[PDB]
Amino acid sequence: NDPGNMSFVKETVDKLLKGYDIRLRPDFGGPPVCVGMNIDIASIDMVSEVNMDYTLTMYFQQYWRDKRLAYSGIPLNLTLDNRVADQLWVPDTYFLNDKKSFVHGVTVKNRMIRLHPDGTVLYGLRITTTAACMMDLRRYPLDEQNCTLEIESYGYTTDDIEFYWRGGDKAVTGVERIELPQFSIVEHRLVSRNVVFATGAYPRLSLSFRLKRNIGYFILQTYMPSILITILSWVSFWINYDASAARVALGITTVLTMTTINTHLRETLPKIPYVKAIDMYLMGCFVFVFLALLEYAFVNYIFFSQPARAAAIDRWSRIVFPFTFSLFNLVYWLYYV
Amino acid sequence: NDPGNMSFVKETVDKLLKGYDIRLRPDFGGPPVCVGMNIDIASIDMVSEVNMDYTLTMYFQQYWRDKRLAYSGIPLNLTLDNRVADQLWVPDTYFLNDKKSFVHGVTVKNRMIRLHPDGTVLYGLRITTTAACMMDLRRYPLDEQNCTLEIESYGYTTDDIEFYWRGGDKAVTGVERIELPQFSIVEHRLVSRNVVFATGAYPRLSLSFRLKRNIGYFILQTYMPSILITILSWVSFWINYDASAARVALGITTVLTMTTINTHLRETLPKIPYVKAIDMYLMGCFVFVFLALLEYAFVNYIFFSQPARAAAIDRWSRIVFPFTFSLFNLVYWLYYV
Amino acid sequence: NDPGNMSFVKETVDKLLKGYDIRLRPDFGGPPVCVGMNIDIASIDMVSEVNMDYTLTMYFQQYWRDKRLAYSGIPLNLTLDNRVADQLWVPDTYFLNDKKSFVHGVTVKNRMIRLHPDGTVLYGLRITTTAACMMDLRRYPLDEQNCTLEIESYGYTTDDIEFYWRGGDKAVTGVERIELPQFSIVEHRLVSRNVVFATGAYPRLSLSFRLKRNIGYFILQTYMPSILITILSWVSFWINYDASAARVALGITTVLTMTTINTHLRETLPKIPYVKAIDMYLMGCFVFVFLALLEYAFVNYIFFSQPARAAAIDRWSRIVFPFTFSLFNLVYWLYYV
Amino acid sequence: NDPGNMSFVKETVDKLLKGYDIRLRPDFGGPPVCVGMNIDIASIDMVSEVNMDYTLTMYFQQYWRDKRLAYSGIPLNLTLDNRVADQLWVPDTYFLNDKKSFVHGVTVKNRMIRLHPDGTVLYGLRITTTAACMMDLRRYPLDEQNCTLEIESYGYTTDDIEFYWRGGDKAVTGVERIELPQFSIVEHRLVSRNVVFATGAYPRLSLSFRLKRNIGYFILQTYMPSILITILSWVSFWINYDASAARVALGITTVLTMTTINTHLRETLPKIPYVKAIDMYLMGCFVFVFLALLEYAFVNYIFFSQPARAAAIDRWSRIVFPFTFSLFNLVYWLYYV
Amino acid sequence: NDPGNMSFVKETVDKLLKGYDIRLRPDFGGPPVCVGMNIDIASIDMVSEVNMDYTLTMYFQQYWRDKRLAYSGIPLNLTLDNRVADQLWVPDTYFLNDKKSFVHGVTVKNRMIRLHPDGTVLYGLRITTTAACMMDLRRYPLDEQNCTLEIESYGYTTDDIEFYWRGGDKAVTGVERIELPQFSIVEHRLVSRNVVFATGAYPRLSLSFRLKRNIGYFILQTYMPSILITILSWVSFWINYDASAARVALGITTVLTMTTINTHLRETLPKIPYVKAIDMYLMGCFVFVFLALLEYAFVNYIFFSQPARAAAIDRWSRIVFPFTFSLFNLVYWLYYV
Ligand SMILES: *[C@@H]1O[C@H](CO)[C@@H](O[C@@H]2O[C@H](CO)[C@@H](O[C@@H]3O[C@H](CO[C@H]4O[C@H](CO)[C@@H](O)[C@H](O)[C@@H]4O)[C@@H](O)[C@H](O[C@H]4O[C@H](CO)[C@@H](O)[C@H](O)[C@@H]4O)[C@@H]3O)[C@H](O)[C@H]2NC(C)=O)[C@H](O)[C@H]1NC(C)=O
Ligand SMILES: *[C@@H]1O[C@H](CO)[C@@H](O[C@@H]2O[C@H](CO)[C@@H](O[C@@H]3O[C@H](CO[C@H]4O[C@H](CO)[C@@H](O)[C@H](O)[C@@H]4O)[C@@H](O)[C@H](O[C@H]4O[C@H](CO)[C@@H](O)[C@H](O)[C@@H]4O)[C@@H]3O)[C@H](O)[C@H]2NC(C)=O)[C@H](O)[C@H]1NC(C)=O
Ligand SMILES: *[C@@H]1O[C@H](CO)[C@@H](O[C@@H]2O[C@H](CO)[C@@H](O[C@@H]3O[C@H](CO[C@H]4O[C@H](CO)[C@@H](O)[C@H](O)[C@@H]4O)[C@@H](O)[C@H](O[C@H]4O[C@H](CO)[C@@H](O)[C@H](O)[C@@H]4O)[C@@H]3O)[C@H](O)[C@H]2NC(C)=O)[C@H](O)[C@H]1NC(C)=O
Ligand SMILES: *[C@@H]1O[C@H](CO)[C@@H](O[C@@H]2O[C@H](CO)[C@@H](O[C@@H]3O[C@H](CO[C@H]4O[C@H](CO)[C@@H](O)[C@H](O)[C@@H]4O)[C@@H](O)[C@H](O[C@H]4O[C@H](CO)[C@@H](O)[C@H](O)[C@@H]4O)[C@@H]3O)[C@H](O)[C@H]2NC(C)=O)[C@H](O)[C@H]1NC(C)=O
Ligand SMILES: *[C@@H]1O[C@H](CO)[C@@H](O)[C@H](O)[C@H]1NC(C)=O
Ligand SMILES: *[C@@H]1O[C@H](CO)[C@@H](O)[C@H](O)[C@H]1NC(C)=O
Ligand SMILES: *[C@@H]1O[C@H](CO)[C@@H](O)[C@H](O)[C@H]1NC(C)=O
């Protein structure tokens, strides 16, 4: 009778679970059971291009109605121990594009079961999942990616289970609180549909983020060293042509440094066959430094018979190379921005 | 009487599982139980030459008949909770060449049990398996590999269980949707046979893929740097022979860069005792740059007494080296393509 | 009767657990259960900037009261086997910012259950948790970070469970015994509050540390090499200006070494998009070495027509560069200390 | 009666397992139970000098007799579901030198239980184990290693259990099909004995392989680069002694390359306190390149006053160095082969 | 009657376990139960300074007396199946300073239960534990470390459980068979005491090893390259001072090689704020090579006006530098040995 009478609550719960068959979904053989889902995104741990996946930690909450769990006489919502979730029926929800996921289990399994007088069940889990995200790196590092989390029922079709976002556009919360050092979340979308396979139509939910990559790290890491190496190559134009060792050493060092930068950058990323934007910039810088070395080679070749022509070539290169490099940078940064 | 009456369905399921012995296969002591298998490949995560394996995520579905599970009066297929699979006999199917594999268990064990009125059981799992694949890298990176997944019964012989691809050549789906950045799937084949061991004959299914390696990454990563270093070595032929430091530095840097490229490339791949195609190309490039350095050494040796001969040697080298390297590249690319 | 009579104690415990419902919290339907918590920190294993987290091993003890477990006639506290914790209600306490935590299980599960005559339960665990800690590295490596451990109830709201630090400021011990090679713990704080989510208000505890980074490692690893490279660059001001190869080699090696140091240091840290203090120092050192190389370029450019001016420029550089670098170091170390 | 009558077989199995005590070994208190063991080696995954261990995948089958499981009236071998193994007594067989081993569990636990009418039990497991193997790398990479797998009973002494290799020399199969890229399996041996510990005498089986390391990888990776660097050092002898920068650069680059090769190779292997064969070869090559540099230093020292002596020294070095290096290689390869 | 009657033994064991309460320790409410412990160290896998820990595999055996398990009429020691350990009381023994430990589980859980007529239980496990060991690397690599394993009861205090080494100083065996390539075990000690915490006094056992680091690897890896680089720097003293490029290149290469060696060695070890012995040696070698380069700088500065003084400085350096470096090595090795 009294809500505080734990004996009465125990009797009510035992009556609820007596004869309860966990093998049967609510309203088995009848209308599909509607499961409304919410996500509270705690954080996005990392976004990996090498593995083409991102790690996501969230509170995943499911909401459905089981008339077998309807109780009367207790005007309270029963928050039960998570272990009771083993004695109930729960949807076979799984993430379609994940690779490794787990439910946290310290100190207890991170699980919540709440029953309502009308038979409504709220079932919450804390899930850290590494979801696969194929990425198009043709504009890297100035690229924008779209990473999705796909939620689907495993065994039951749309004739047995239906999904919806509980709350419309506000079902997924906490996106604005995500701190990604390298990315900024431009937008997120919720999609609900049905996907047909050989075994029938299955409900599907999709939580998609659009990530815009920050460029400051790559400016500090790759572009500035390339510009500095190109200017270092230009330095040889003010050295006298008789100093063969000095200018040849400058050319060799700049060329080898550009090649090492390019190879190291490519080794950092996964083995993709196409050419990226940063690869184009590095190849342009390599062309510039190699042309500077070839210019000195020409000057050394012709400076014995025609010293005036060699001096003129050096003097003209001193102006041509910075101007042409400025034009190359201008067109490059206009194309990719 | 009523398919929508959950009490009747519970009674029927309990009657099916009453007296059910999970230790005995269907038709125990009689004809072998036929199990048909389908695979829906979600993705191929990675292909590693270093570990000689590949990761594969799939929906693995088995189909058999258990007359003990035949039910009447319910004109519906019973999609039961996955936990009921712990109370039923399931085939001891395993992957012969796998190293690590698991079944995804978020938010529940990715498992599906469907019963049919005639006693047919459909049993689905979502499995991520890392299968070993020995690779013949003698034509690397222009090689073509053949990686197989072998499926076999562990304890039961052909007198007890038989395997067949359910649907013939259409048993495996999703192969055309696989996105491997480094490989392209030329073909896939399904094979069914029996393998004899000391304990008897066992059914065996095989799903084999033929992968062709995309060459763009290795063109951008290894071949182009080698060509550029060889051209850089050629640059020394236009430098005056009195500039000993410059030309010796050019030769040294080219030789050392070629050696470092070769060693790094060999370190990237697993330790194999034979020579790869890319190794042949790198050794040829090293020979060319070393011959350039030796040519300068000869010119420096003879340029005091015979300056005209030294100048003639430099002039002839300026033509001979590019032409010979072009011929070497031509024959190399004709041999391996 | 006799406390040493094991049969009497067994009967008492069986009476305690007879009719006990683990699905219901103590005082279910009435006042919330107050759960006090103590932490004895065994060690902070590591602090990772790349992963933005820290590993922490602790003895986490919870203290609550369940009148269902009150016993009389035994004037002793019952230290029971840890397995009995599976037959009792325990709080659904979890860590908000953890990423991978576990309870040690050798030789048995590192778990303690102690019962008191009035029904008080003490429940201890040994937990190794990897808690996330976002770090602001703008003053790196002279930064001061703040890492928190958040403790919260998962299912029950403040209407059911309340948290408090058992012992106040002395509720957490072992902080003074923490030996971090790279950090020193300036202070730790304990905070108790309530956090409101869509499902209601939940209790919250926070154990926060203020970590100060030791600077000796970075002095020995980054700053001293940069200073030595800058002094090496200054060395070229004493070499004769006609030794073009020597001075150009000095400039090239110093500039390239500075760039490689900067790039390696950036690659040792997470891909943050901003500029750190050590990045500013490295950029200053790079500017100094580049200015030295450009100074030699100017001297070589003008040394044929105006040798006296070139000698004067070298002589003035010998004084200006050390003085300017000393001023730069002075202002840098005054700004960041 | 009918072997195909599943009810009769279920009754027989229930009678077999009724009153069965898994805590008691067969013939408890009497003669020891003989367990015969077979191994079908599927593969040897990898051999690690750094970790001093090797990974092995195998089908491990045990054969014993349990009179409690003897059944009559069924002239068939009962292949039972693997789960029945949880209800039977199985030997406590473990691997003495293993470090991390597991039983494959997809799709089910890779376990086989087969019973015979006379109570004979065949129990098979597919096991992957990382077994430690201490290696003597004094003759590395021309070394020959001996790696063993040790099988022992953990709790039962020779008064309770006895091991034997079932089939004798043919107990272990699949050795000839093992494909190790770096090693070749010269021989394998099977040993059976008893080992005395503080608790008594325990049965012991040993499966040992003798592996011979292939040399092709190290020929292409370490020896050839060293030889090429030594020839590069010799190149300086034909350069004129007035080209001080060129010859000094050749000496410096060869010496530094040799040192880096040696240090990298030592870093790849575990921190062993002794000298390997390849270490001896690398030290010899370093001695040769250092002697070449010192020879140029002597020539540059004495070439001003005595040009004829310097030219004679260079001419003699051109012959002495290649010949002495050939002799060194000859004696080195004779000693280690 | 007869011990060979398995039915009688099963009856005896069932009577022993009938009414057995695993929640109560032996002599609950009375005198503390004394637990005697033995360790048979199988191996010490690896000692890591970076992680500051060591991996240890051991047979850990506990010995106690439970009068509830005393049986009569069977003059034998009952070696029971390890699974019966789940039906008995076992001490809550744990390792105070472990980080990740597991009990091996192939083929079965590596566990042993042996009962004696007087109710004495022997309980053995095979445990691989990674125990933290704080190390003082000030005298590294000539350091001597002290790594301990701490064994303690988790829940029971000294009023309930007491620990002692069974066999005194011979309780721990197998120490002399430990093969650490990088360390030699000078001594091992056993300590027994009691530690007071807020919850009471707990028994404590300690097994400590004193490890002395072998110096051969570091002699071959760090000291010899440093000495060789210093001699290489000395080489420049015999080169003519007019060869500016050669001597400046020698100085630059030696200085940069020393810096790279020091930085790489510091990177190998964990980040520590103090200076190690090898750091002192490397800094001394850097000072020597830098002083050689500065000596050449002075010679080049003064060799135009005072050629005789420059020649005298070179000649005196040729003797001073080797002698001073020999003195530095002598004092360094005397200090640290
Ligand atoms: C990352 O990339 C993914 C994949 O490309 C993007 O996901 C797509 O998102 C769009 C919305 O932005 C989806 O389009 C919408 O689909 C809804 C569901 O369609 C299902 O049901 C209808 C019948 O009702 C079927 O015809 C259909 O085949 C599906 O089964 C529609 O209801 C939406 O309709 C809206 O637009 C139409 C006009 O086009 C209007 O008439 C409607 O009123 C309504 O406004 C819409 O079509 C698309 O389906 C998603 N694709 C997938 C594969 O899921 C992510 O958006 C992207 N991430 C970001 C951040 O952009
Ligand atoms: C990667 O590499 C693997 C291994 O080499 C390849 O696998 C082989 O694939 C071929 C098919 O492409 C297989 O050949 C087929 O084998 C079937 C099974 O043979 C067993 O059973 C028959 C009796 O039914 C026995 O006679 C036989 O000895 C075996 O015990 C056959 O049924 C097939 O028959 C077909 O061809 C024959 C002619 O050869 C015709 O007469 C038939 O009518 C029919 O058309 C066929 O022979 C081969 O067995 C596979 N090998 C293994 C070890 O499994 C993969 O194909 C490769 N990857 C790719 C992509 O190609
Ligand atoms: C890798 O390294 C390991 C360790 O060194 C090698 O293992 C040894 O292998 C040899 C065989 O090659 C073993 O020697 C044999 O041991 C048998 C068992 O001895 C026990 O039992 C007998 C009674 O049966 C006792 O007397 C004895 O004390 C032991 O308790 C013997 O039965 C064998 O005897 C055979 O040879 C002798 C002559 O030597 C004859 O007189 C006999 O008639 C008979 O033919 C033999 O002595 C040795 O025990 C193994 N040691 C260990 C520690 O396991 C591996 O062989 C090696 N790997 C490879 C590939 O070689
Ligand atoms: C690595 O480093 C650790 C930590 O420093 C070393 O461990 C210490 O080892 C020494 C022995 O070598 C230990 O000293 C011994 O402690 C015992 C326990 O003391 C407790 O109990 C006594 C009462 O029984 C109390 O008085 C005391 O306060 C403690 O509560 C003592 O029983 C031992 O007594 C012995 O020496 C005394 C004289 O000092 C004699 O009178 C006794 O008869 C007896 O011979 C002794 O004092 C010390 O406690 C250990 N410290 C820790 C923290 O465990 C390791 O030894 C070291 N590794 C190596 C290889 O050396
Ligand atoms: C509490 O509920 C139980 C079970 O219905 C009942 O027996 C008991 O009387 C109730 N308590 C009171 C005070 O009525
Ligand atoms: C459902 O089936 C049960 C068992 O046969 C029966 O008792 C019950 O009356 C049925 N439901 C209805 C509405 O008749
Ligand atoms: C111990 O308690 C049991 C249960 O109350 C009782 O039957 C037994 O007699 C007691 N022991 C003694 C010695 O009285």
Ligand SMILES: *[C@@H]1O[C@H](CO)[C@@H](O)[C@H](O)[C@H]1NC(C)=O
């Ligand atoms: C099968 O065995 C059971 C149990 O002995 C028996 O009741 C049944 O009649 C048998 N089947 C046939 C067809 O005889």
Ligand SMILES: *[C@@H]1O[C@H](CO)[C@@H](O)[C@H](O)[C@H]1NC(C)=O
């Ligand atoms: C073995 O012990 C059981 C149980 O006491 C008994 O029933 C049986 O007769 C004994 N066997 C013999 C041969 O005495």
Ligand SMILES: CCCCCCCCCC
């Ligand atoms: C950067 C330090 C350079 C030291 C040169 C010393 C020359 C002294 C000439 C009197």
Ligand SMILES: NCCc1c[nH]cn1
């Ligand atoms: N199902 C194959 C089992 C096997 C192979 N080899 C030995 N046992």
Ligand SMILES: NCCc1c[nH]cn1
């Ligand atoms: N105990 C907090 C549960 C939660 C957070 N967000 C959503 N649900």
Ligand SMILES: NCCc1c[nH]cn1
């Ligand atoms: N069965 C091996 C038991 C053992 C070895 N060492 C100590 N105990």
Ligand SMILES: NCCc1c[nH]cn1
């Ligand atoms: N067995 C010691 C338990 C402990 C330590 N600190 C707090 N509790």
Ligand SMILES: [Cl-]
């Ligand atoms: Cl966790």
Ligand SMILES: [Cl-]
């Ligand atoms: Cl998973």
Ligand SMILES: [Cl-]
């Ligand atoms: Cl652990």
Ligand SMILES: [Cl-]
């Ligand atoms: Cl597995």
Ligand SMILES: [Cl-]
């Ligand atoms: Cl294990």
